[PDB]
């Protein structure tokens, strides 16, 4: 349309909504797949730890929930005639919870796979596992904080 609001301006917004959930779901997938292969190899012989050792896939799933919130929040601010200012803050919120939630979902996958294979040879590692795991989780929450803060400047 005009100079402030062109027609390619909701491409950034649409890409951002897609990016927020595809990159967090790729990181939460890698976290689930390495933790689930650590669980389904762990509890072959130690089946009574099946509810303690599942916290890496719950915690990797919280990255997916964080990604989902950003996508819903910036799809509420999408529109045909939107300014290009709000297009790039929806793309900044997109790839700031995106490429941070995939790296945080990767690090939950490697730490959670090392943890659930380690907190069964010695159960004293279960407190040390999750405190490392929280650190690899809130890096996705730090990505989420930027997105919320940056989506707070739309219109």
């Amino acid at each position: 349309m005009t100079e402030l609001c062109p027609v390619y301006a909701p491409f950034f917004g649409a890409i951002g909504c897609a990016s927020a959930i595809i990159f967090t779901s790729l990181g939460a997938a890698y976290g689930t797949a390495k933790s689930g292969v650590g669980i389904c190899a762990t509890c072959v012989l130690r089946p009574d730890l099946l509810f303690k050792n599942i916290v890496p896939v719950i915690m990797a799933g919280i990255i997916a929930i964080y990604g989902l919130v950003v996508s819903v929040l910036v799809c509420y601010s999408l529109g045909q005639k939107q300014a290009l200012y709000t297009g790039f803050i929806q793309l900044g919120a997109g790839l700031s919870v995106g490429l941070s939630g995939l790296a945080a979902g990767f690090a939950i996958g490697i730490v959670g796979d090392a943890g659930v294979r380690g907190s069964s040879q010695q159960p004293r590692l279960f407190v040390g596992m999750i405190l490392i795991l929280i650190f690899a989780e809130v890096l996705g929450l730090y990505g989420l904080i930027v997105a919320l803060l940056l989506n707070s400047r739309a219109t």
Partner: protein, 314 residues
């Protein structure tokens, strides 16, 4: 070394935690003063063995029993690490066991060619190299028959009894030499070329030492491949191999193989983003399960003169 800890982080952290269970040179001085096997059991439980003989009795505690409970405790740790590895490391730990099953098909043939029992002979066989066809070894005593019949389905398939042993073992160690230079990264390149070469060295020296043509049964991957292979091929006496072994600066004066191995193994732990650690732990813990056995043989019968022949660099 920023990509190593993805698949091999928990692996190296636990293998480097197993080398602190390698009981040190002070841990043998208090362990060579027992004179009964019960007392040795009593103060072997303070180590990172950690009361592994808690189920056996004390009246019937054989010398072999400690040799096989400490090796079972070794081997459950090995295939605990082995089934947690990725496609660049699960293969490497399988290639460790491939040199074990060559010593198992070398012993099953020389045990089944003579009048012996399958069960009794099978007990002595090393259990890291164990494929499902290995308990047979009795279809034929012919070397040609074994390859088609029984070794065709094994991973020994791309590779008289000692003649086909070195025929398998040289092609194995060549295939294991050009695997560790292909898919294994830089801090274990220089390790798995030099440590592996040493294994080609002290096997090729034992070729000429046990032979007193020979150029096809000798492995050529080490420092003796270009020069010392031709000099060691035409050596018929002990002085011919003694003159041929003087050309290398790292092997002169040796013709002491495990002491040079353990000193070459203590520098292998000096790297700390490499997968040569699991070979250094395997050969170190297999060393200290025959050090404990060498002490327990000097304790079971009273041989106090030749005890201090255990060798620990760690």
């Amino acid at each position: 070394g920023v990509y190593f800890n993805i698949d091999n982080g928990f692996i190296e952290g636990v293998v480097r935690g197993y080398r602190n269970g390698l009981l040190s040179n002070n841990q043998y001085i208090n362990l060579t003063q027992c004179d009964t096997l019960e007392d040795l059991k009593l103060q072997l439980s303070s180590t990172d063995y950690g009361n592994f003989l808690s189920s056996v009795s004390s009246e019937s505690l054989t010398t072999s029993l400690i040799q096989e409970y400490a090796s079972s405790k070794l081997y459950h740790e090995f295939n605990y690490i082995r089934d947690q590895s990725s496609g660049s490391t699960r293969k490497f730990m399988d290639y460790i066991t491939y040199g074990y099953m060559i010593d198992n098909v070398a012993l099953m043939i020389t045990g089944t060619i003579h009048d012996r029992d399958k069960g009794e002979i099978l007990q002595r066989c090393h259990p890291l190299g164990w494929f499902d066809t290995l308990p047979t070894l009795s279809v034929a005593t012919d070397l040609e028959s074994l390859y088609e019949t029984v070794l065709v389905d094994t991973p020994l398939a791309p590779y008289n009894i000692e003649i086909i042993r070195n025929k398998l073992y040289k092609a194995y160690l060549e295939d294991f030499y050009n695997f560790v230079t292909e898919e294994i990264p830089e801090p274990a390149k220089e390790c798995m070329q030099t440590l592996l070469g040493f294994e080609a060295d002290r096997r090729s020296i034992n070729i000429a030492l046990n032979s007193l043509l020979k150029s096809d049964l000798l492995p050529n991957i080490g420092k003796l491949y270009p020069l010392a292979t031709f000099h060691l091929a035409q050596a018929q006496d002990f002085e011919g191999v003694r003159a041929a072994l003087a050309n290398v600066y790292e092997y002169r004066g040796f013709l002491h193989f495990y002491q040079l191995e353990m000193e070459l193994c203590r520098d292998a732990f000096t790297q700390q983003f490499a997968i040569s650690t699991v070979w250094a732990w395997m050969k170190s813990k297999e060393q200290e399960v025959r050090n404990i056995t060498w002490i327990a043989e000097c304790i079971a019968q009273n041989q106090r003169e030749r005890i201090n022949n255990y060798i620990s660099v760690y």
